């Protein structure tokens, strides 16, 4: 469970960094969603 607490911390911080950087294409998503 502590090993996973390490993974949740390390992986989720990378996921949050990857997600915020990606931003769900949030400008490309609006570009794509407003088109569809």
């Amino acid at each position: 469970t502590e090993v996973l607490l390490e993974s949740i911390q390390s992986k989720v911080e990378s996921i949050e960094q990857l997600q915020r950087k990606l931003q769900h294409v949030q400008p490309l998503e609006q570009q794509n969603n407003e088109m569809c």
Partner: protein, 110 residues
């Protein structure tokens, strides 16, 4: 008269009228079947170990391998271009229908 003759004729027409799957359809009643609300919560102190490893580690590793960027925005904008080719085609048909519709009315007018 867009207010008298239509109302008059409607009453005359009115007077002549006075004279004369199983699972899917059931779910439609308005309740979606519940899914596995287990993986997210769990508990360190609480019960079950598999949930820790049989739920969170392997999926997080698959997530971190899946969560990506290598291609990044290039893969997204490539699909955005396809959507523009799909959209213009519809409006071209809107025109073709618009022309033939006005063309038929044009013949009636004469």
């Amino acid at each position: 008269i867009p207010d008298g003759y239509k109302n008059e004729i409607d009453q005359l027409v009115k007077k002549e009228f006075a004279n004369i799957t199983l699972f899917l359809e059931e779910y439609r009643r308005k309740y979606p079947r519940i899914d596995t609300s287990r993986y997210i919560p769990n508990e360190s102190s609480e019960v079950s170990l598999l949930g820790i490893v049989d739920s969170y580690l392997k999926h997080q590793e698959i997530v971190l391998d899946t969560l990506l960027p290598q291609t990044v925005s290039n893969q997204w904008r490539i699909n955005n271009d396809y959507i523009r080719q799909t959209c213009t085609i519809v409006e071209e048909m809107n025109i073709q229908q618009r022309k033939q519709i006005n063309d038929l009315e044009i013949y009636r007018k004469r």
